[PDB]
Design a protein around this ligand. Structure first.
Ligand SMILES: Nc1ncnc2c1ncn2[C@@H]1O[C@H](CO)[C@@H](O)[C@H]1O
Lengths: 240, 198
């Protein structure tokens, strides 16, 4: 059966018809997680060098204009000095949307010194509203891409959820599960996060946060010896 | 014209100018990742003569996600969409850092396409995996609804890829099979002894 033909006949996206041992890893991640830390900051006016120490993974979620139908253009994003806060070996996850970002986000990654190793696709079903447009678009756009970059030396590259309600710009929380399952280290930064995305194990920085608890010295103390090189997936280091 | 046509050849050496202009180009190239083509051979393919106004569909994987973007731009296209094929078994279940559930097809535009039916299909294909390197047949229907009845050309196709309205090129096709009189004429002029070299 041709689900492409079915979508043109009925408006049900092909992804609507996709169908369908770790807990002793999820709780190790949970045990190793730092307290949630968060900082209200207007990132266009804020010197990101003040966020220390250098991060093992960075999740970057700039508010693109295409998400709505203060936005950030790819001009703005590309001029962020991400290389100044990434650890020499570290990872980036960049939400690129579905338009020119798939190209300009790759320019960003290379500009900051990463190479892309994965292209994670958020595929949006419309099971709840069958049926229902960038001027250059050739096809109806029903997915978003989050590009994974690496610098220095269980899961699949797909996230499938129902398309969110109009004006709801949240990305699927499953992206956090994928990132944390890689065991990349414990200094994790989420730029352009919100009150709603704050999460144990993460430093969240963004303009709309209503409260802050970030202290650079307190934050660094979570990673001082003997805890400087943990992956975030092993046992806590015994004290006393 | 309308029934399937193909040319067994080395795409590096065929003079594709004898083929005319096409509303849609599709390619599934043997990228040199990990019988392939080097990055320079891909760059030098004479894609620009194949179209004036229309669309290019370019399958990519691994580091060809970037190299394919380079070729697309060098050949004169702007990437304007990206199709993903979610790979399933016959029960509609999905088949280095992450397991891969999908393959990507870049969509480039060249010139000013007029009269195409943009927006009928969406950019996700859900379809069963068949033999290796065999892309889903659903793409031909998406392309036909996008641009019905127009001339199309496929590069690096295999025998199962031949389709009405398409000319298929590849080195595992069986001989030559041409029916368009414009193309038959120019092929005889350019290759009077039926041999493609250099
Ligand atoms: N220079 C080439 N010219 C034409 N077809 C090729 C060439 N190199 C590889 N192919 C073919 O492209 C297809 C890739 O799936 C295979 O049939 C493969 O043999």
């Amino acid at each position: 059966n041709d689900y492409c033909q079915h979508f043109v006949d009925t408006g049900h996206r092909p992804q609507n018809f996709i169908r369908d041992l770790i807990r002793l890893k999820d709780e190790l991640i949970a045990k190793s997680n730092t307290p949630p830390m968060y900082l209200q900051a207007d990132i266009e006016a804020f010197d990101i060098r003040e966020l220390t120490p250098k991060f093992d993974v960075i999740l970057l979620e700039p508010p693109l204009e295409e998400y709505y139908r203060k936005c950030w253009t790819w001009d703005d994003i590309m001029k962020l000095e991400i290389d100044e806060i990434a650890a020499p070996r570290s990872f980036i996850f960049l939400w690129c949307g579905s338009g020119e970002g798939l190209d300009l986000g790759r320019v960003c990654l290379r500009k900051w010194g990463y190479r892309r190793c994965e292209d994670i696709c958020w595929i949006k079903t419309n099971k709840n509203n069958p049926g229902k447009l960038d001027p250059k678009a050739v096809f109806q756009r029903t997915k978003e891409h989050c590009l994974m970059g690496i610098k220095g030396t269980v899961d699949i590259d797909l996230i499938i959820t129902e398309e969110p309600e109009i004006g709801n710009i949240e990305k699927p929380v499953e992206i956090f599960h994928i990132i944390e399952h890689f065991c990349l280290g414990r200094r994790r930064l989420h730029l352009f996060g919100r009150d709603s995305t704050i999460r144990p194990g993460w430093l969240t920085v963004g303009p709309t946060l209503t409260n802050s608890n970030y202290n650079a010295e307190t934050y660094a103390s979570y990673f001082s010896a003997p805890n400087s090189y943990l992956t975030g997936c092993t046992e806590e280091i015994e004290r006393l | 014209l309308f029934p399937p046509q193909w040319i067994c050849c080395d795409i590096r050496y065929l003079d594709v100018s004898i083929l005319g202009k096409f509303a849609v180009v599709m390619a599934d190239p043997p990228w040199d990742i990990h019988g392939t083509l080097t990055d320079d051979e891909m760059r030098r393919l004479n894609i620009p003569v194949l179209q004036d106004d229309g669309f290019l569909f370019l399958w990519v994987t691994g580091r060809a996600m970037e190299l394919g973007r380079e070729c697309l731009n060098l050949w004169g296209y702007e990437r304007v969409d990206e199709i993903i094929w979610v790979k399933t078994n016959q029960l509609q279940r999905i088949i280095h850092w992450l397991n891969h559930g999908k393959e990507h097809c870049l969509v480039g535009v060249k010139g000013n396409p007029q009269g195409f039916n943009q927006g009928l299909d969406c950019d996700v294909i859900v379809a069963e995996v068949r033999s290796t390197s065999h892309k889903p047949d659903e793409i031909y229907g998406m392309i036909e609804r996008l641009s019905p009845g127009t001339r199309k050309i496929e590069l690096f196709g295999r025998p199962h890829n031949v389709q009405p309205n398409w000319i298929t090129l590849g080195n595992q096709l069986d001989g030559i099979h041409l029916l368009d009189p414009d193309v038959v004429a120019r092929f005889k002029q350019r290759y009077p002894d039926g041999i493609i070299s250099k």
